Amino acid sequence: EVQLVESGGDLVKPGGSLKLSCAGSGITFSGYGMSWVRQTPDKSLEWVALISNGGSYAYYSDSVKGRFTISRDNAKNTLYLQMSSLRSDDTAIYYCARHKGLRGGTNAMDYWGQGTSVTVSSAKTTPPSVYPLAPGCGDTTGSSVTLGCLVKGYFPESVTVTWNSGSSVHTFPALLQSGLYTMSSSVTVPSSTWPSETVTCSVAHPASSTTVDKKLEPS
Amino acid sequence: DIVLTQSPASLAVSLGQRATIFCRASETVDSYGNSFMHWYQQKPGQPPKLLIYRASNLESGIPARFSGSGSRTDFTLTINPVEADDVATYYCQQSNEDPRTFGGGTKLEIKRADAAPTVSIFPPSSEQLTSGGASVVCFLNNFYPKDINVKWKIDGSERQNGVLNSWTDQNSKDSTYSMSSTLTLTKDEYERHNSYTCEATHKTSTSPIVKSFNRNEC
Numbered sequence A: 001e002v003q004l005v006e007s008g009g010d011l012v013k014p015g016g017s018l019k020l021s022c023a024g025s026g027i028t029f030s031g032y033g034m035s036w037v038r039q040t041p042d043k044s045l046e047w048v049a050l051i052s053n054g055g056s057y058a059y060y061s062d063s064v065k066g067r068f069t070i071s072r073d074n075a076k077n078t079l080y081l082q083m084s085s086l087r088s089d090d091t092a093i094y095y096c097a098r099h100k101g102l103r104g105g106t107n108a109m110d111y112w113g114q115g116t117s118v119t120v121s122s123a124k125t126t127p128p129s130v131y132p133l134a135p136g137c138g139d140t141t142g143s144s145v146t147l148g149c150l151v152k153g154y155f156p157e158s159v160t161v162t163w164n165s166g167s168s169v170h171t172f173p174a175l176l177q178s179g180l181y182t183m184s185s186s187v188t189v190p191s192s193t194w195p196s197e198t199v200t201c202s203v204a205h206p207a208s209s210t211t212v213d214k215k216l217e218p219s
Numbered sequence B: 001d002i003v004l005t006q007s008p009a010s011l012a013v014s015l016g017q018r019a020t021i022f023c024r025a026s027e028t029v030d031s032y033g034n035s036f037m038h039w040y041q042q043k044p045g046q047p048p049k050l051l052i053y054r055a056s057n058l059e060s061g062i063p064a065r066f067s068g069s070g071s072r073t074d075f076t077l078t079i080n081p082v083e084a085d086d087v088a089t090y091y092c093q094q095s096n097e098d099p100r101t102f103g104g105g106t107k108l109e110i111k112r113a114d115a116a117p118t119v120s121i122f123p124p125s126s127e128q129l130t131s132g133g134a135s136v137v138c139f140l141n142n143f144y145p146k147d148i149n150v151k152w153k154i155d156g157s158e159r160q161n162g163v164l165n166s167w168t169d170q171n172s173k174d175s176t177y178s179m180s181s182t183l184t185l186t187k188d189e190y191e192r193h194n195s196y197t198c199e200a201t202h203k204t205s206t207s208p209i210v211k212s213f214n215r216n217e218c
Helices: B126-130 B187-191
Strands: A004-007 A018-024 A034-039 A046-051 A058-060 A069-073 A078-083 A092-099 A109-112 A116-120 A129-133 A144-154 A160-163 A169-177 A180-190 A200-205 A210-215 B004-007 B010-014 B019-025 B037-042 B049-053 B066-071 B074-079 B088-094 B106-111 B118-122 B133-143 B149-154 B157-159 B163-167 B177-186 B195-201 B209-214
Touching: A004 A092, A018 A034, A018 A092, A018 A116, A034 A078, A046 A069, A046 A078, A046 A092, A058 A069, A078 A092, A109 B049, A129 A200, A129 A210, A129 B126, A144 A200, A144 B133, A160 A169, A160 A180, A169 B163, A169 B177, A180 B133, A180 B163, A180 B177, B004 B088, B010 B019, B019 B037, B019 B088, B019 B106, B037 B066, B049 B066, B074 B088, B118 B195, B118 B209, B126 B133, B126 B187, B133 B149, B133 B187, B133 B195, B149 B163, B149 B177, B177 B187
Parallel strands: B010 B106
Antiparallel strands: A004 A018, A018 A078, A034 A046, A034 A092, A046 A058, A069 A078, A092 A109, A092 A116, A129 A144, A144 A180, A160 A200, A169 A180, A200 A210, B004 B019, B019 B074, B037 B049, B037 B088, B066 B074, B088 B106, B118 B133, B133 B177, B149 B157, B149 B195, B163 B177, B195 B209
């Protein structure tokens, strides 16, 4: 989450291959079993593979058996997951986790990464268009005011909207629309503070290496 | 392969009350003088978090509101008292045998007092229009329960097509839901009309909550 850091997630053609990495920062893998687990856009949380401390034992879910290979390097403090014969439903956020190290049997997964996103599809990476949502010029102003950003036509998932850097935010989950995602984000703020004060949504789409600002101006 | 069956799949619990979640294993998960059933919490947009290891041990920093019990093939996670921030999916996992398959998960919803939605309507931005498109967006905010209906009108006439709706995950602070309804038009059709209407119908009342704008003045 801070301790473990996944990387390598990417868009990949069906039938293709990909290799994820997981690095410890501030903790050692030496001595511990480890697992990869994934969350798909929605089946339920899925365990997919584990490997022993020394590496001579590993086990896989049926779902990935034969396609995926778990491996590790305790010297470099790194865990890996080689993926091959990738299919549509391998699309997921992949987490690595270190098992607790108690004696007397097996252990739960106590340290988890933030995850890395993998998409398996023949569609192409596309950055978002970002449109401001501001009240119409005829709106009867109230005590507070709700503003938003419409983030349209991007691929793959996901994006992160950040309002004025660092609450009153709502994040509407993205919906797939003719091969492309759309989502939106709102923020509500007192009428006394906007438009007198600057409001800005910053939208990051890591996959396309893109950040789009929008300064909310009054209609 | 040990199969884990969680029950219930869904439950709604009021603040201050007890949530009881069961996980049943197809074969015993006990050996070595211990019981290898583990419980995790997953909130939207976060990695899973360990709550309870080896049936009954609280992970450090997890509050004692969470409690694990059971043995052999029958286990229970009890959250008592439930707090707003407990909205999550809860998973069991056993490690007595590989594969360490999770249960299907139990989604915990916070029950709270019925609430009517706040409606905001937004015309397409100049920028979108200049680019050939037009999306009209309505937010229906902070309502409970989740079920809600929206209808759109263009100059008083109901519009079916072009509508997509997306609900938020229950808010971890006020236990409400929100949802966006977006009407997608071509610029040329948008520009041929005056008044746009978003009508929310929520079980909290017979009368819709209506918001509108007109293109014809300012």
